[PDB]
Amino acid sequence: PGVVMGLAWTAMGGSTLFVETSLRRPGDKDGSLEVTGQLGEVMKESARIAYTFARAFLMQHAPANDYLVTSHIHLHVPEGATPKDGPSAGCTIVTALLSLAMGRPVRQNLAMTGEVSLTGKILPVGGIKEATIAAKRAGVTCIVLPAENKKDFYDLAAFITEGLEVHFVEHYREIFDIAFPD
Amino acid sequence: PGVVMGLAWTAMGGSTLFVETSLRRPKDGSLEVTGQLGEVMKESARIAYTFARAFLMQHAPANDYLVTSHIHLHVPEGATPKDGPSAGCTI
Amino acid sequence: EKDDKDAIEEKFRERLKELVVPKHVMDVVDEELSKLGLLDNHSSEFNVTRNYLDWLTSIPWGKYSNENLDLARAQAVLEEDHYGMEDVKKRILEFIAVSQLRGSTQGKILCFYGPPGVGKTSIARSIARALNREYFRFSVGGMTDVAEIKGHRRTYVGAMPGKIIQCLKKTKTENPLILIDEVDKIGRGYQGDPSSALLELLDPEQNANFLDHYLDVPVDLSKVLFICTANVTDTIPEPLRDRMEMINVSGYVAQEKLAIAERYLVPQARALCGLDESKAKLSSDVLTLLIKQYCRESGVRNLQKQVEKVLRKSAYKIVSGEAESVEVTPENLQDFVGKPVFTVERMYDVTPPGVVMGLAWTAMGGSTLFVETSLRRPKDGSLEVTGQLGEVMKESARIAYTFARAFLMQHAPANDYLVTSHIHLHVPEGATPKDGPSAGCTIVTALLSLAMGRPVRQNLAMTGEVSLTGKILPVGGIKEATIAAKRAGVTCIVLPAENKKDFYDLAAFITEGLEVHFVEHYREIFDIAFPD
Numbered sequence: 082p083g084v085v086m087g088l089a090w091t092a093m094g095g096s097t098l099f100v101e102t103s104l105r106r107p108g109d110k111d112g113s114l115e116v117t118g119q120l121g122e123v124m125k126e127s128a129r130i131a132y133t134f135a136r137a138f139l140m141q142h143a144p145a146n147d148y149l150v151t152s153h154i155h156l157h158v159p160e161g162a163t164p165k166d167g168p169s170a171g172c173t174i175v176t177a178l179l180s181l182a183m184g185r186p187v188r189q190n191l192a193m194t195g196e197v198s199l200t201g202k203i204l205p206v207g208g209i210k211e212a213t214i215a216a217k218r219a220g221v222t223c224i225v226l227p228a229e230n231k232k233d234f235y236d237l238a239a240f241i242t243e244g245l246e247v248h249f250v251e252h253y254r255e256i257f258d259i260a261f262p263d
Numbered sequence: 264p265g266v267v268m269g270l271a272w273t274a275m276g277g278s279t280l281f282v283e284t285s286l287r288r289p290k291d292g293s294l295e296v297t298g299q300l301g302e303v304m305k306e307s308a309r310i311a312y313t314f315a316r317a318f319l320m321q322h323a324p325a326n327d328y329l330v331t332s333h334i335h336l337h338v339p340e341g342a343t344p345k346d347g348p349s350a351g352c353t354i
Numbered sequence: 355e356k357d358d359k360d361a362i363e364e365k366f367r368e369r370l371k372e373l374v375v376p377k378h379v380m381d382v383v384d385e386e387l388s389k390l391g392l393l394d395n396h397s398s399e400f401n402v403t404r405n406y407l408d409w410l411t412s413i414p415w416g417k418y419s420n421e422n423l424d425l426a427r428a429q430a431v432l433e434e435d436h437y438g439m440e441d442v443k444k445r446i447l448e449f450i451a452v453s454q455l456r457g458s459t460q461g462k463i464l465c466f467y468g469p470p471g472v473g474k475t476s477i478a479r480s481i482a483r484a485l486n487r488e489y490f491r492f493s494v495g496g497m498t499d500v501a502e503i504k505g506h507r508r509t510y511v512g513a514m515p516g517k518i519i520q521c522l523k524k525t526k527t528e529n530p531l532i533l534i535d536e537v538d539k540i541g542r543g544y545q546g547d548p549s550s551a552l553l554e555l556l557d558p559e560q561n562a563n564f565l566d567h568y569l570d571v572p573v574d575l576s577k578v579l580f581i582c583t584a585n586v587t588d589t590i591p592e593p594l595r596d597r598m599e600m601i602n603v604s605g606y607v608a609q610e611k612l613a614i615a616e617r618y619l620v621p622q623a624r625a626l627c628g629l630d631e632s633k634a635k636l637s638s639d640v641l642t643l644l645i646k647q648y649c650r651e652s653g654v655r656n657l658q659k660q661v662e663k664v665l666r667k668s669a670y671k672i673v674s675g676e677a678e679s680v681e682v683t684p685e686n687l688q689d690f691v692g693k694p695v696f697t698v699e700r701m702y703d704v705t706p707p708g709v710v711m712g713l714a715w716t717a718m719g720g721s722t723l724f725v726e727t728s729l730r731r732p733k734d735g736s737l738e739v740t741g742q743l744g745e746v747m748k749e750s751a752r753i754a755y756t757f758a759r760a761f762l763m764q765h766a767p768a769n770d771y772l773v774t775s776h777i778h779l780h781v782p783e784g785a786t787p788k789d790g791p792s793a794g795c796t797i798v799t800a801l802l803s804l805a806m807g808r809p810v811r812q813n814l815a816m817t818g819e820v821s822l823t824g825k826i827l828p829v830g831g832i833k834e835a836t837i838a839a840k841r842a843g844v845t846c847i848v849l850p851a852e853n854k855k856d857f858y859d860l861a862a863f864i865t866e867g868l869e870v871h872f873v874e875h876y877r878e879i880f881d882i883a884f885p886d
C-alpha cells in the first residue's frame with residue numbers, strides 16, 4: 082500500500098517509475114507532504130496539485146477519513162540520483178496518496194500516466210510510444226492513459242499494442258474504480 | 264464553481280486558459296499558486312486575492328470564506344510557462 | 355602597361371598638390387607610389403596598392419571648411435531652424451564667440467541628453483549649417499566591434515577604412531561636425547570593448563593624434579566639434595562622462611508641442627508628401643486633439659508619425675478624386691487616424707482614501723505614478739508591497755512604513771491602525787518595472803490616508819525620498835516630473851526643498867499655473883495633503 086507503478090519517458094526506450102509514500106510522523110494542526118528525489122520544478126508543482134486534489138477527493142469518497150488532512154506524508158520516487166521532471170506522473174501521485182490513506186494496495190500489474198489538474202481532470206501527456214514500450218518490458222497487464230491520447234496510442238505499430246489492456250479516462254473518478262475495484 | 268475561463272496570448276495565436284481554485288484544507292487564510300507562473304503573474308494573484316477578499320466584505324459581510332479558509336489556485340497545463348498581468352480579473 | 359601606370363601616377367600626384375600633407379604622410383605616399391611603379395596592372399596586389407593610395411590621397415590634409423564667425427547670422431539660423439532649446443543655443447553662441455577670440459577654428463566635445471523626439475539629432479544638423487560645417491552621423495548604441503571605428507588591416511581582403519576615415523573623404527575637410535548617437539546605450543562585450551576607443555576620441559590630449567587600422571598614420575582629430583546624444587546620463591560610462599560636457603534637453607508641454615507641430619512638423623510632412631498649404635489644411639484643434647488623445651510621449655516623435663499619416667491619407671484622397679482639397683476638421687479626424695489611443699489622462703480622476711498620486715522619471719520621459727493601499731485582513735501588523743519594485747524601491751517602502759507608524763503615535767495616539775492591521779500596498783501597472791526612492795514621501799501619505807480614512811487633496815502630486823526621521827531628500831528628474839505633472843493636469847505639486855534649483859530652471863510658462871510647495875520635513879507635507 083502506498084506504492085504505485087508509473088510510466089516515464091527515457092531516451093533508452095523509456096522506463097517505468099514507482100511512487101512510494103510513507104508516514105513521516107506517527108487539534109487545528111494540519112499535515113504536510115514532503116517530496117524527495119531529483120524532481121524538477123514542474124514535477125514538484127504537480128505533486129502539490131495532486132496533494133490538493135487527493136485531499137478533496139477523500140472528503141467526497143470518505144468524509145470520516147482524515148488521513149490526508151492531519152498526518153504527515155513523505156513521498157519519494159526511487160532512483161533519486163537520476164533527475165526527473167514533467168507532469169506525466171500526476172495521476173500516479175494521487176493513487177499513491179489515496180492508497181496510503183485508505184490502506185489498500187493498488188491493482189497488481191497496473192501502470193498509469195497523465196497530467197491531472199486539482200479538479201480531477203486528466204490531461205494528455207507526451208511520449209506515448211515510449212511509455213507503451215516500457216510498459217510491455219515491465220510486463221504490465223493494464224495501462225491507464227488519458228482519453229486525449231487515444232489517437233497517439235492507436236497510431237503505434239500493431240506489434241507493440243496487442244496483449245495490453247488499455248484504459249482511456251477523462252476524470253480521475255474512472256481511475257479510482259480501476260485502481261481500487263473492490 | 265471556482266473555475267473561470269480566461270484569454271491568453273501565445274506564439275501560435277490566441278489561447279483560452281481556465282483558472283481553477285479549490286480548498287486546500289477543510290485563523291488567517293492562505294493562497295497557494297501552482298503552475299509555471301511568472302513573477303508578474305504571481306504578483307497579480309496576490310493583488311487579485313487582496314481585492315477579492317476586500318470585495319466580499321462590502322458585498323457579503325457575513326461570508327468569511329476568503330479570510331479564514333485555505334485556497335489552492337492552479338492554472339492548467341503546468342508544463343507551459345505563463346506570465347503577464349493579463350489574467351488578473353479572471354483570478 | 356607602364357604608360358597606363360604612368361598616367362595613374364601623374365593624376366594621383368596632382369590630387370595631393372593642394373593638400374598640406376604632413377611630414378610623416380608624404381613618405382608613405384612615395385613608397386606606395388614606388389611600389390605601384392614596379393607592379394603590373396594584372397597583379398592582385400596592384401589593386402590593393404591602387405585602392406589604398408587612393409584613400410590616402412582622398413583624405414584631406416590641412417584643408418579646413420570655411421567657418422562662419424558671425425554671431426548675429428548664426429543666431430538667426432538657429433532660431434529659424436528650431437524652437438526653444440535655449441541652453442543648446444546659448445552653448446553654440448558661446449562656441450562661436452570663443453573661436454572669434456582665439457582667431458582660429460577649434461573643436462569641443464558636447465553631449466545632449468534627454469527624452470527621445472526632443473530634437474537632439476535635428477539640432478545637430480542646424481548647428482552644422484549655422485557653423486558652415488559638414489554634418490556626419492553615426493551610432494554606437496548596442497555596438498560591440500571596435501574595428502568599425504578604425505577600419506581593418508590593409509592586407510585583409512575586402513577591408514575598408516573606418517567611419518571617421520570614411521567621414522574625411524565625404525566631408526572633404528579636416529573640420530567636420532561628427533554626431534554620435536545612443537552613447538548611453540553602449541555595453542560591455544566579449545569580443546571587444548569600444549569604450550576605450552571612445553575615451554581616446556573624446557580626450558582632448560589623445561584625439562590630437564588618432565591611429566586607425568587601414569591608413570596606419572596619425573590623423574589630427576582635434577578642431578572637430580564632437581556632439582553626442584543620449585537618453586540618460588547614469589548609464590553613460592564614468593570615464594566617458596568626464597570628457598563630455600553635459601547639456602540637458604527637456605520635453606515639451608502641450609502648448610509647446612502645438613507650436614512645434616504648427617511651424618515645423620506640419621510644413622515638413624506636407625512638403626515631403628507633395629502637397630501644398632491650400633490643398634491640405636491642418637487646424638490647431640486637430641493638432642491639439644492629436645497631442646491630447648493620440649500621443650502620450652514627452653517628445654514629438656510619435657506626433658510626427660500621426661501627422662505624416664494624415665497627410666498620406668489626404669494625398670491619396672485628392673489623387674483618387676474624392677475631393678480636390680482636404681480639410682482635416684475634428685469631425686472627420688477618425689477617417690484619418692481612427693479611434694483615440696488614449697482616453698484617460700490619469701487613472702484616478704478622484705483619489706479614494708489610501709490613494710496618492712506620485713511622479714516618476716525615466717529615460718522614456720516623465721510619467722505619473724499612483725500608490726494604492728488596502729486592508730489585506732479585517733499581534734503585529736504587516737505590510738505587503740506588490741508590483742515590479744526594485745531593491746531600492748522596496749527598501750524605501752520599509753522606511754516609509756516605519757516612519758508612518760512613528761508619525762501616527764505623535765499625531766493620533768489613540769489610532770493603532772498602522773500597527774494592528776495588515777496592509778497591502780500596490781503600485782498599479784505591475785508589468786512595468788519600478789525602482790528608486792523617488793516615491794518615498796508618496797508611500798507615507800498613502801499609509802497615513804488609509805489609517806485616518808481621509809482622502810488626500812485632489813490634483814496633488816508629490817515626490818521625494820524620505821528618511822527614517824521624516825527628512826525629505828532631493829530626487830532627480832524634476833524637469834521631467836514637472837512636465838508629466840502638467841500633462842496630468844495636477845494643480846498642487848510638492849517637491850523637496852533641495853530641488854528648488856531644478857524646478858526654477860524650467861521655462862516661465864511651465865512653472866506658471868502650478869502651485870509648487872517646497873518642504874524639508876514630512877510635517878509640512880502632512881498639512882498640505884490634509885488641510886483639516
Ligand SMILES: Nc1ncnc2c1ncn2[C@@H]1O[C@H](COP(=O)(O)OP(=O)(O)O)[C@@H](O)[C@H]1O
Binds near residue numbers: 435436474614618655
Ligand atoms: N523645437 C523644435 N523645432 C523644430 N523641430 C523639432 C523641434 N523639436 C523636435 N522637432 C522635430 O522632431 C523630430 C525629432 O526627432 P529626433 O530628434 O531625430 O529623434 P531623437 O531625439 O530620438 O534623435 C525632428 O525631426 C525635428 O524636426
